[PDB]
Amino acid sequence: GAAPAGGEVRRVTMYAERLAGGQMGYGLEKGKASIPGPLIELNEGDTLHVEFENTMDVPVSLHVHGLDYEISSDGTKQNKSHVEPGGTRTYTWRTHEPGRRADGTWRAGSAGYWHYHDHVVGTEHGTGGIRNGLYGPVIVRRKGDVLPDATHTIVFNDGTINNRPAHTGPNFEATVGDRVEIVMITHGEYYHTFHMHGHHWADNRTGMLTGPDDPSQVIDNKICGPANSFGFQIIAGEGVGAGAWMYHCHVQSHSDMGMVGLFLVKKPDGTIPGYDP
Amino acid sequence: AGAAPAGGEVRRVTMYAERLAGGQMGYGLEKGKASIPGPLIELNEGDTLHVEFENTMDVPVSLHVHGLDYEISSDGTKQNKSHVEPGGTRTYTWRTHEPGRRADGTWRAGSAGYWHYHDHVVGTEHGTGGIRNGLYGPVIVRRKGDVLPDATHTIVFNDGTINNRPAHTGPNFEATVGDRVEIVMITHGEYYHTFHMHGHHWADNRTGMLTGPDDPSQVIDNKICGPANSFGFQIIAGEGVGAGAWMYHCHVQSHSDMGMVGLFLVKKPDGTIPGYDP
Amino acid sequence: GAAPAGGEVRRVTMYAERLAGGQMGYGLEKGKASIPGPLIELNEGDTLHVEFENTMDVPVSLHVHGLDYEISSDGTKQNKSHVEPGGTRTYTWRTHEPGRRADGTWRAGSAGYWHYHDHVVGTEHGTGGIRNGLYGPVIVRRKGDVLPDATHTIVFNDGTINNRPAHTGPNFEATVGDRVEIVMITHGEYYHTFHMHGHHWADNRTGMLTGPDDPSQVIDNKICGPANSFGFQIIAGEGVGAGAWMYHCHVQSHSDMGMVGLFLVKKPDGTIPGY
Ligand SMILES: [Cu+2]
Ligand SMILES: [Cu+2]
Ligand SMILES: [Cu+2]
Ligand SMILES: [Cu+2]
Ligand SMILES: [Cu+2]
Ligand SMILES: [Cu+2]
Ligand SMILES: [Cu+2]
Ligand SMILES: [Cu+2]
Ligand SMILES: [Cu+2]
Ligand SMILES: [Cu+2]
Ligand SMILES: [Cu+2]
Ligand SMILES: [Cu+2]
């Protein structure tokens, strides 16, 4: 459907936990941490209280992009908003609709594709926490935004995708016609360029033109550096049909070293033409 | 000097991949006529293009395009078994579509814009050797009513080279003050770049020109780009600046000192370029 | 506070001086050269005459972005538009309003967040001059732009902010409510990603959406590379209140090695909670 107007106050538990291999992740339920962390979804105007527990043995933080938070929810050591080993703390994120200011100018709303990550593990910029996997997607919708059938997050962290061993995807499945949403976050040291075979989107808030008067470049390829976040919705297979549609960083060595995955768009019968496993 | 019409024609073209001097490989429209960059494809939103392809090399090659509609059988990857074995032939079909209102009430963007095609199998199964070797080219898909330029020039930053040329060898392009000049800019390889033109500027959007007083697109003369990025614009040569040898270059400092520079030689109506002196 | 319609003829002297430590800077009076250079503001339509003088022992130039200049003001040795040691030149920049061409298309105005820099020190592309400090900002306003209470310029020159040593800011101060203009320039070899805590803006010309029909992405983070320039206006603390709000390049080793600084937003009473 469509996103309603917001303004609810939401509460959720979140945990930072150690995972295998010196990795670390956020999770909504203890023992269910993951990398990327859980996807947060808000309608503009919602407030979200994150009751947060650090189950690790090193201080950790929650720092969000793009949303409204006071300095006590910055999630940084420099204003003592980190969480000590064993400690707990409520982080609050607010968001707002757009509107006219009394000064006659237009105040942008919070709507968009954002992300949260650690800011204190290893360095005062979270270089270790981010590298171990403390990051996840936040989506803030505007009233009237079209809603997807599925959302998939794709995170270029250094030379990996979602901290996975090279050459292991992830793959994402869908049926021709599905309204599929991608969240694309970049973290760490390197720039990249994100490409999707067979698909394309508009380079604006939503990845869809708002109608025939929207001048945004339509693209299938985008450069991004650390902490960028963007998102788009595609119709699976539109104009192209089913198949295993590669997506990859297009920096050539990066695709050859395993920053590749498969958008597996299936016919209505669940098969993928020409896909040999 | 007119306007792109509505599309819908079924077009067909022969294209070859052939070796060139120095281990370079290029696309062509006629045998022994390959160029780096390869030849420019122009479609109008709605055209279907059939590329009757021929590999004239000893090694496999493929043809993968950005942005245009193609089924999985015209992917041009080994993974999808759509490459060309040596001495072989294959018809690649690219389709395009106009914008329109979907059933769900949303708006489908049309295929129009500045795109490109490259190899996907030489060297690695991502075309890393093929792209290095020069197997890349521009595709312009126009929307009904897009202004057409007096000339189109293509500028490809392939790694540390421009159009696989030697350093400090341009290329240079000429125009006359007031010409509507179209630039296609494509990037390939490992490195990010920043493309700058002295004397000129454009809007960062689909066409490179604002649509009217309401278009918020930023106006820029410098643009960060990366591998497989492609954008395009039309400028008016000499606009508010006049004739002269207008340099263009990548703006990463080391890249411009190594020779990623060229000239936009804009001439007065009589043919003179003030102060030019190679 | 709105910008007026342009069209004045303005004049300015500019000097290129050595500074401490093999650095070089532009300045509006002798012995007043700064890194980054002095902020030049113009309205769409203005012409600006820069009487430039090179007080250095090596040739220097002055090249601009985005503005209208003839080839004689290009500011490169290629056109012999460089200034030899001790010498003087007048560089002339012009600007235009938007409006429709005879051929029917829309011509964009000059308004934007631009900059100027050397083109001949060290190499024929100013690599040594830029590395040395020879860059500064230029803002050009469109009639009706809203004006700001303060403009701050932030230049990522390779691994430094404004050629400063690592971990030495700079910091900027405001008061909750203040309407602040940031100018962001990048020079050198590297790409960066600029990021501000607690604040966000629109990725368009002005930094703010024109109204509900602007589709520009709203962001708090932007990739950029050498000779990119952009700007934006924020309402300090808007929706977030006071505090020492960090900015930095978000490339992890850059923030770790000192490409960081603070945006100090004060309560009306002067104080910064938590600082
Ligand atoms: Cu930070
Ligand atoms: Cu990459
Ligand atoms: Cu592709
Ligand atoms: Cu961040
Ligand atoms: Cu590919
Ligand atoms: Cu370059
Ligand atoms: Cu320039
Ligand atoms: Cu490609
Ligand atoms: Cu230059
Ligand atoms: Cu940086
Ligand atoms: Cu932040
Ligand atoms: Cu420059």
Numbering used by the authors:
A (entry chain B): 41 to 317
B (entry chain A): 40 to 317
C (entry chain C): 41 to 315
Reproduce, without paraphrasing, sentences from the article in which this PDB structure was first reported.
Laccases (EC 1.10.3.2, p-diphenol: dioxygen oxidoreductases) are among the very few enzymes that have been studied since the end of the 19th century. These multicopper enzymes catalyze the one-electron oxidation of various aromatic compounds, coupled with the full reduction of molecular oxygen to water. Most of the currently known laccases function in acidic conditions at temperatures below 60 °C, but two-domain laccases (2D) oxidize some substrates in alkaline conditions and above 70 °C. In this study, we aim to establish the structural factors affecting the alkaline activity of the 2D laccase from Streptomyces griseoflavus (SgfSL). The electrons from the substrate are transferred via the His–Cys–His pathway to the TNC, which is formed of one T2 copper ion and two T3 copper ions (T3α and T3β). For this purpose, we constructed mutant forms of SgfSL by combining previously obtained substitutions that significantly increase the catalytic activity of the enzyme (Met199Gly, Met199Ala, and Arg240His) with the substitution Asp268Asn that is outside of the TNC environment.
